[PDB]
Amino acid sequence: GPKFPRVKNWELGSITYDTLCAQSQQDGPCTPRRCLGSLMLPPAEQLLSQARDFINQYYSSIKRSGSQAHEERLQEVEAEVASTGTYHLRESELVFGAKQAWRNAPRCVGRIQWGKLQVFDARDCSSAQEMFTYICNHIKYATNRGNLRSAITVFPQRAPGRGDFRIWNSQLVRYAGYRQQDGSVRGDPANVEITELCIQHGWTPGNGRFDVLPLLLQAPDEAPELFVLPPELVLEVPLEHPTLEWFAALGLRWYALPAVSNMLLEIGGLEFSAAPFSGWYMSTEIGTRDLCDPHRYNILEDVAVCMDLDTRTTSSLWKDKAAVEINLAVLHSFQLAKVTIVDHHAATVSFMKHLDNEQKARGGCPADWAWIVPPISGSLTPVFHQEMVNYILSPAFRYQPDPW
Amino acid sequence: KFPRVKNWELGSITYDTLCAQSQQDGPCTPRRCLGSLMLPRPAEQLLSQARDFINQYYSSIKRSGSQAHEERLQEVEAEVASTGTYHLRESELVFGAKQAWRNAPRCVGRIQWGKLQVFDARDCSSAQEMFTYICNHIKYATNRGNLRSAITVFPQRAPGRGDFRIWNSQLVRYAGYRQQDGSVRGDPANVEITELCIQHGWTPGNGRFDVLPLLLQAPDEAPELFVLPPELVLEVPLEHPTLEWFAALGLRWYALPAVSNMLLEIGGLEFSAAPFSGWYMSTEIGTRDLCDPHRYNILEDVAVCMDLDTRTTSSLWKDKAAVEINLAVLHSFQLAKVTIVDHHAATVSFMKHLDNEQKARGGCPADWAWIVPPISGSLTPVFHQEMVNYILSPAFRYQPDPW
Numbered sequence: 186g187p188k189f190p191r192v193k194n195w196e197l198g199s200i201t202y203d204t205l206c207a208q209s210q211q212d213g214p215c216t217p218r219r220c221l222g223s224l225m226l227p228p229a230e231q232l233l234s235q236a237r238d239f240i241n242q243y244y245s246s247i248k249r250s251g252s253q254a255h256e257e258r259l260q261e262v263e264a265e266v267a268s269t270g271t272y273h274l275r276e277s278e279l280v281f282g283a284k285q286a287w288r289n290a291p292r293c294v295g296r297i298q299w300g301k302l303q304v305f306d307a308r309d310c311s312s313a314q315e316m317f318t319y320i321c322n323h324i325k326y327a328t329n330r331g332n333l334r335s336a337i338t339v340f341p342q343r344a345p346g347r348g349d350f351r352i353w354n355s356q357l358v359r360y361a362g363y364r365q366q367d368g369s370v371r372g373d374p375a376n377v378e379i380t381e382l383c384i385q386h387g388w389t390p391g392n393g394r395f396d397v398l399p400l401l402l403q404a405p406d407e408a409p410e411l412f413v414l415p416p417e418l419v420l421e422v423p424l425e426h427p428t429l430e431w432f433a434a435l436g437l438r439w440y441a442l443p444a445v446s447n448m449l450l451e452i453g454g455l456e457f458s459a460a461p462f463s464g465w466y467m468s469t470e471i472g473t474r475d476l477c478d479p480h481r482y483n484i485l486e487d488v489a490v491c492m493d494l495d496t497r498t499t500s501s502l503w504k505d506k507a508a509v510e511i512n513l514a515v516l517h518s519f520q521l522a523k524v525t526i527v528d529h530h531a532a533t534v535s536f537m538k539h540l541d542n543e544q545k546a547r548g549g550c551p552a553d554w555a556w557i558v559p560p561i562s563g564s565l566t567p568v569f570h571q572e573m574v575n576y577i578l579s580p581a582f583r584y585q586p587d588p589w
Numbered sequence: 590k591f592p593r594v595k596n597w598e599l600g601s602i603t604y605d606t607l608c609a610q611s612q613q614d615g616p617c618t619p620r621r622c623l624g625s626l627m628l629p630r631p632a633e634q635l636l637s638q639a640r641d642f643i644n645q646y647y648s649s650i651k652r653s654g655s656q657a658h659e660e661r662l663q664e665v666e667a668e669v670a671s672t673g674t675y676h677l678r679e680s681e682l683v684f685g686a687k688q689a690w691r692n693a694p695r696c697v698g699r700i701q702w703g704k705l706q707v708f709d710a711r712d713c714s715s716a717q718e719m720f721t722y723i724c725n726h727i728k729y730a731t732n733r734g735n736l737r738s739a740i741t742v743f744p745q746r747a748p749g750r751g752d753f754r755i756w757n758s759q760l761v762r763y764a765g766y767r768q769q770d771g772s773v774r775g776d777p778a779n780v781e782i783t784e785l786c787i788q789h790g791w792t793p794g795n796g797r798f799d800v801l802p803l804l805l806q807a808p809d810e811a812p813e814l815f816v817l818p819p820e821l822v823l824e825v826p827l828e829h830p831t832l833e834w835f836a837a838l839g840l841r842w843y844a845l846p847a848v849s850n851m852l853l854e855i856g857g858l859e860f861s862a863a864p865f866s867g868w869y870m871s872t873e874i875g876t877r878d879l880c881d882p883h884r885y886n887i888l889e890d891v892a893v894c895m896d897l898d899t900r901t902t903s904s905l906w907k908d909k910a911a912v913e914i915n916l917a918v919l920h921s922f923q924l925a926k927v928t929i930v931d932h933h934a935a936t937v938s939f940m941k942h943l944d945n946e947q948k949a950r951g952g953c954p955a956d957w958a959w960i961v962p963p964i965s966g967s968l969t970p971v972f973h974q975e976m977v978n979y980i981l982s983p984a985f986r987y988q989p990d991p992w
């Protein structure tokens with residue numbers, strides 16, 4: 186009967202309909218002919234309608250839709266575009282749009298926390314040193330000595346024919362990737378290019394598997410300036426296993442604060458090219474993807490050898506065994522170091538709770554199944570059995586071209 | 590318009606040009622992707638589908654545009670033109686069924702698509718006959734543990750009349766008995782089909798692994814009930830290579846995975862009963878069938894057996910027990926000398942399959958959420974491979990339950 190997508194949970198046998206998708210004003214990659222769900226990467230009038238939509242969302246969200254303060258703000262926005270081509274957000278509109286952006290992000294399993302985000306307004310920032318300061322305050326606040334708090338620092342928006350504010354690094358904390366003159370990679374192979382870029386702008390490079398990179402920060406129309414994070418601010422966790430005593434001797438570690446810095450925050454048309462945000466990790470990001478991907482640290486074989494497994498064949502399930510212990514080592518060490526982390530079971534459960542809230546509040550929740558299901562123990566988590574609708578709402582986070 | 594398909598482990602890129610051959614729409618639109626849903630909710634069409642298929646056949650055997658090619662297109666026009674339908678020649682049928690497997694976007698086993706034994710059962714007029722055919726297929730496919738893939742094609746659907754159907758969703762299935770307190774004894778997925786069996790006069794067991802009888806239906810007749818001779822149903826008692834206690838759980842699973850509720854479409858013809866079988870990939874037994882909360886749900890028990898900390902999700906008791914259960918399965922199948930494939934070997938081989946398909950056809954429809962195993966996904970190479978999904982024909986479809 187209802188002509189909205191029917192959404193089923195195959196474990197519990199329950200059924201919903203996503204009506205929220207009707208609100209989507211941007212096309213994704215799929216068509217009736219073929220599904221492109223698994224791919225990672227798929228102006229006056231145009232700006233004004235995006236701005237009107239957002240202001241409408243704002244007033245809705247405080248329950249004053251249609252009111253004269255709503256029609257006045259609408260008027261104020263169109264007046265400001267009329268004469269300058271852009272406009273600006275009130276403080277509390279930025280706070281709402283930034284949260285709304287996290288809320289709308291289809292690939293984030295952490296959304297249950299969407300309403301608990303600290304928004305640092307940094308639209309006054311006018312230099313690269315100042316960005317540094319702002320970022321340090323961020324890390325300091327967000328890190329909070331282990332008791333991690335979600336936050337986002339918002340720098341000034343794209344302006345017409347004026348350079349963007351850009352953080353070159355893809356995350357605020359990143360280990361160096363040193364290309365060897367024997368093809369291989371020392372450190373994190375994900376970070377090869379940014380390392381090369383830092384060195385070229387005059388960083389004296391280290392030599393280790395876990396060297397914290399400096400920040401490359403770009404004020405409008407200036408070459409990027411290089412900034413070393415003072416070590417005492419970058420909280421790391423040494424990794425050790427609860428029962429395998431030799432795991433500590435591997436000298437593996439990860440940093441506490443996952444802070445993404447290369448995304449664009451789009452709110453009602455306006456684009457914030459430098460709006461770094463952070464939360465806390467899910468255990469599989471480090472334990473499974475970062476440490477075990479063949480194209481990352483790739484420690485799987487090393488660990489299984491230590492665990493004395495048969496690596497000559499697949500049917501020993503040697504990879505599955507080691508993956509689990511590496512993950513268990515991530516959880517145990519973070520717990521021991523009193524640093525916030527969430528395991529993939531706890532995390533997905535809370536995402537199911539989120540789906541139920543959003544069903545009630547908005548009529549659905551855009552979700553990307555391939556990304557919400559964790560990279561180990563998929564069907565062991567309730568999300569695997571949950572059909573999901575994926576679509577682009579706004580405000581949003583967006584990828585953007587690398588500044589170089 | 591041609592999708593760029595990337596492998597993020599190796600950084601290699603291809604292009605799907607095979608998706609341009611799709612003639613049937615999927616559930617996605619530009620507005621929203623519905624790729625994670627399980628079910629998707631006359632003389633000119635049949636004639637053109639028919640044509641396209643016959644072409645696929647002659648081109649397949651390189652005789653395209655030739656003598657027997659034009660003259661077979663005539664046989665088909667003639668036959669539809671005057672009877673509103675037509676019939677397939679055995680070899681064309683053999684080709685269609687191989688191709689429907691090849692086109693199956695959710696199948697990880699397609700490296701094998703060319704090795705398929707095809708039984709023509711189109712001369713069947715009775716559930717009786719259907720059964721005899723069903724037993725031959727089982728005997729053949731099972732081959733004393735050395736599983737061989739097979740399909741058995743019963744007569745096509747027909748305008749005037751009811752379908753030949755096999756009511757059971759698989760050929761071998763364990764009973765599910767809904768007990769006093771809304772509990773379930775045995776396989777919870779087969780409560781409905783156990784109930785139907787009981788309605789049509791089957792005396793039920795009361796164990797956890799009671800092989801169900803088959804309900805087979807010939808057109809417009811009530812279904813009939815047939816009991817598989819226990820010797821034709823090869824079963825593997827599960828044990829663990831190091832945990833001596835695991836066998837005491839009394840767990841087991843059947844060797845032959847043979848699907849029987851799926852419709853086979855070839856050149857616009859529909860085959861409502863065409864059971865097919867190959868061999869299990871281990872995660873199906875070890876992870877979905879035994880650990881799914883709405884299946885046998887053995888995860889907690891194993892874990893307690895393993896003296897693991899059940900109190901908390903962070904001890905990874907779920908993941909640990911799951912690995913050992915999947916191990917017990919491979920060990921057991923290996924010990925009983927019955928074909929099985931782990932999810933590492935399977936996906937490795939599927940990768941090779943995408944490579945052949947790339948050279949051979951310009952693409953391969955695949956369904957990322959089904960190709961990636963239910964545990965240890967990113968530990969397998971398919972996890973890092975982008976994939977295009979779309980519907981090619983010949984095809985397997987779902988069809989409504991006949992009751």
Ligand code: HEM
Nearest residue numbers: 287290292293294295298335336462463464465466467582
């Ligand atoms: C609070 C704890 C959080 C957890 C556990 C969490 C978890 C995750 C995970 C596991 C992913 C998939 C990442 C990957 O595998 O690469 C993700 C994606 C994402 N996260 Fe969250 N997150 C959290 C907080 C946040 C915050 C504070 C924001 C921003 C305000 C955020 C925004 C996003 C966005 C936009 C994506 C999509 C990335 C993409 O589109 O490629 N998350 N998150």
Ligand code: HEM
Nearest residue numbers: 690693695696697698701738739865866867868869870985
């Ligand atoms: C021979 C070894 C085979 C292996 C290892 C294998 C493996 C699998 C697996 C793991 C699935 C996912 C389904 C699930 O988890 O429920 C699947 C799906 C499928 N398989 Fe295969 N399979 C094999 C043979 C065959 C054969 C012989 C056929 C038919 C000729 C076939 C046709 C299909 C189809 C049509 C699907 C998709 C079902 C759907 O859309 O729900 N497979 N296969």
Ligand SMILES: Cc1cc(N)nc(CCc2cccc(CCc3cc(C)nc(N)c3)c2)c1
Nearest residue numbers: 443444445447462463464465466467584585
């Ligand atoms: C806040 C946060 C929490 C968490 N648990 N993990 C992370 C790290 C995972 C994460 C989250 C968002 C965004 C990204 C990457 C964004 C990104 C950007 C570009 C340009 N290309 C890509 N392929 C990807 C990664 C971040």
Ligand SMILES: Cc1cc(N)nc(CCc2cccc(CCc3cc(C)nc(N)c3)c2)c1
Nearest residue numbers: 758846847848865866867868869870873987
């Ligand atoms: C040949 C084969 C090999 C293998 N390893 N596993 C299987 C079993 C998995 C499998 C494959 C295709 C099709 C199904 C049917 C799933 C299914 C689908 C619908 C709509 N209703 C149901 N009751 C059941 C199941 C079959």
Ligand SMILES: C[C@H](O)[C@H](O)[C@H]1CNc2nc(N)[nH]c(=O)c2N1
Nearest residue numbers: 223224555556597972973974975
């Ligand atoms: C091809 C595939 O979409 C790609 O590897 C995706 C799969 N799911 C993912 N899910 C998360 N959370 N992160 C990822 O990087 C990926 N990779």
Ligand SMILES: C[C@H](O)[C@H](O)[C@H]1CNc2nc(N)[nH]c(=O)c2N1
Nearest residue numbers: 569570571572625626958959960
């Ligand atoms: C809703 C979700 O798509 C559903 O649980 C799917 C996910 N992936 C799967 N993958 C396989 N191979 N088999 C399945 O039954 C499923 N179930």
Ligand SMILES: [Zn+2]
Nearest residue numbers: 215220617622
């Ligand atoms: Zn799609």
